[PDB]
Amino acid sequence: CKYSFKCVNSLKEDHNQPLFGVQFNWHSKEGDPLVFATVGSNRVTLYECHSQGEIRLLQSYVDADADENFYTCAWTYDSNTSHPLLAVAGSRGIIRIINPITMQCIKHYVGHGNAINELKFHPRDPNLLLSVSKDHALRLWNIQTDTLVAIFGGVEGHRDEVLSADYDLLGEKIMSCGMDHSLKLWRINSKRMMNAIKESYDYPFISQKIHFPDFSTRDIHRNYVDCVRWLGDLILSKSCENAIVCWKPGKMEDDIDKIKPSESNVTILGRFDYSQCDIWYMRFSMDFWQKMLALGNQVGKLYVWDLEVEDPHKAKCTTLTHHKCGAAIRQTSFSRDSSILIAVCDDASIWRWDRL
């Protein structure tokens, strides 16, 4: 690994409560300022990154309900006006679409039963929002028509809280994971789903009830699977076992689009090992080009790997540490051009690392 970073700044949010999420806005055009959002307690805060490590506070959203606790956020844009948008959700199970320019709530969606653990936007259609919940289901929303396209759960759905989910690069399929130790595949390029999405745009709307995934395994990890991301046709997933596991459904040669729903095989390609990240609910992230992988630990250390180096042990970068950063890093975010890496903590602190 070639990558090096310098800690240029840090701050602490006045509420002192844990920050669960951080996301840079990757929709902002080249040349425009690098903006990121943080989520924790009943707050959503926007910051702008300037020269010489300057972190400029933009606006603070404070939820009317003092008992709300936001766990996640995701960015999108209005497909018609090119206006940026921000979706947030947490313990209350309510999705809020916030205008990040005015820091005011545009709309909300109840729908979900219980806590929403993660939000993700489709990489091609800015209107398709995926929420994962404590009620064991995933939900696909069309935020342009305010319709719930599909509910993924039921007969062969998750058996405990869904903690994380990810769309692949072209937005053809989703991998979900959770407290039941399983990773489940849900194809959205199926005729049924592609037609349900088309119908959501023609719209009481009848949501699809997807009771059956296209793959399911519980042989990767021995505990809660708290983070999942696609890496091409391969999967990156972790539990609390001090490793991120790189694997694929089926046998070594099995094509991701040829595996059948009953496929019982699973192939591990490698593991990215680290230390002191043995506690539940710690997220890993990648930059846009998927050249870098980052993960924070329970003790303030930030691990980085070069995904372009085949051997994961040889892929290891110099671990990022600051003597004042001792609290659990819940989530990290790379700016679209990966020149900036932000980490957020349990002590409401925010850390800015700039590429050297």
């Binding site: 806005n25 990757w26 929709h27 902002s28 055009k29 080249e30 425009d32 300022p33 903006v35 926007l46 702008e48 933009l58 844009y77 006006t81 090119s82 206006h83 940026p84 990040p100 320019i101 990489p123 091609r124 690069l169 072209l170 890496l231 091409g232 046709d233 391969l234 070594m252 390609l269 846009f288 080009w289 998927q290 372009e308 085949e310």
Partner: peptide, 29 residues
């Protein structure tokens, strides 16, 4: 190898996403 093949998939697909982002002019926050 499985690595090089997967790397080209990521490269091809992220390029498609990058091109779609380049045609866009999302207003500043």
């Amino acid at each position: 190898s499985m690595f090089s093949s997967n790397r080209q998939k990521i490269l091809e697909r992220t390029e498609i996403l990058n091109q779609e982002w380049k045609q866009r002019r999302i207003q500043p926050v």
